[PDB]
């Protein structure tokens, strides 16, 4: 549980926002890329795994599951790569709702930033700090520290 | 001290590696950019602060301390922007040693990657996972969780 993450890919302004969700806390990291390719996905996962103890990634679609470049990054960084089949149909709803929430935040900030990448990082910041009272940023640190101890 | 970070900028291959160090743990985040500008610095700090609870950043030089764009990102993200004067002369030697270690790691991986940005992220991963015994990634999570509790 502390090492499980889910990839998620959503679109805005003709670009692609790639998101990794720490399943047990709801914490996220995200980036803006021109298109989702195996090479962009692989680099994003190398970055994530040098920052958090990533044990498993549920890929966002079959092409990133299949991609030998994505598998090569998961090998390099010690990540178990898995599919993202929603055996719990609850997952489908959680992702869709998260995407709708991020797009709403992005719209509320969009005019403070010239570039979409700035607005997406402002939305990562707001989502991780939001108290729902603990934040997702507090939950992920508590969960992993509990696991280290 | 759980919220205190230090910026650091080093050069390799005609490019700039910008690094944020969590001073109490030694944990790092890093990116490759073509040149250090206040806009690039500001974006990097906005990314960092959406991911960890950044209270204070000691800037790496006077230009990023002065930069109104860097101050605007520190305002947006709720960061106190401070100078990086090594009133403790130990700071100066710790950064130099860190940069030398990162460059050594980058050379040990350099030939597994086409692009420098991949080698830099492999070096972040190796640095943060290295047990010295706990890793910097373990220390930063323990420090902040202890603070939250």
């Amino acid at each position: 549980s502390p090492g499980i993450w889910q990839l998620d890919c959503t679109h805005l302004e003709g670009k692609v926002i790639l998101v990794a969700v720490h399943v047990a806390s709801g914490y996220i990291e995200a980036e803006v890329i021109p298109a989702e390719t195996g090479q962009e996905t692989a680099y994003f996962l190398l970055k994530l795994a040098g920052r958090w103890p990533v044990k498993t990634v549920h890929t966002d679609n079959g092409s990133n599951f299949t991609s030998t470049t994505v598998k090569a990054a998961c090998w390099w960084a010690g990540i178990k790569q898995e599919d993202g089949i929603p055996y719990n149909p609850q997952s489908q709803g959680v992702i869709e709702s998260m995407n709708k929430e991020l797009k709403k935040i992005i719209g509320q900030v969009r005019d403070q930033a010239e570039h979409l990448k700035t607005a997406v990082q402002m939305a990562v910041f707001i989502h991780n700090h939001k108290r729902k009272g603990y934040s997702a940023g507090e939950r992920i640190v508590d969960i992993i520290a509990t696991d280290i101890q | 001290s759980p919220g205190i970070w230090q910026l650091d900028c080093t050069h390799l291959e005609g490019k700039v590696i910008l690094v944020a160090v969590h001073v109490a743990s030694g944990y790092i985040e890093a990116e490759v950019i073509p040149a250090e500008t206040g806009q690039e610095t500001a974006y990097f700090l906005l990314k960092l602060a959406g991911r960890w609870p950044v209270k204070t950043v000691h800037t790496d030089n006077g230009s990023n301390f002065t930069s109104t764009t860097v101050k605007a990102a520190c305002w947006w993200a709720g960061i106190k922007q401070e100078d990086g004067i090594p009133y403790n002369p130990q700071s100066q030697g710790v950064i130099e040693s860190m940069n030398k270690e990162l460059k050594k790691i980058i050379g040990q991986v350099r030939d597994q990657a086409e692009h420098l940005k991949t080698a830099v992220q492999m070096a972040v991963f190796i640095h943060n996972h290295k047990r010295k015994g706990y890793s910097a990634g373990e220390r930063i999570v323990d420090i902040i969780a202890t603070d939250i509790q």
């Binding site: 692989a42 680099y43 090569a72 | 597994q112 086409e114 991949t118």
Partner: peptide
Amino acid sequence: ARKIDNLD
């Protein structure tokens, strides 16, 4: 290119 970031 036989590299982790460029398998070709």
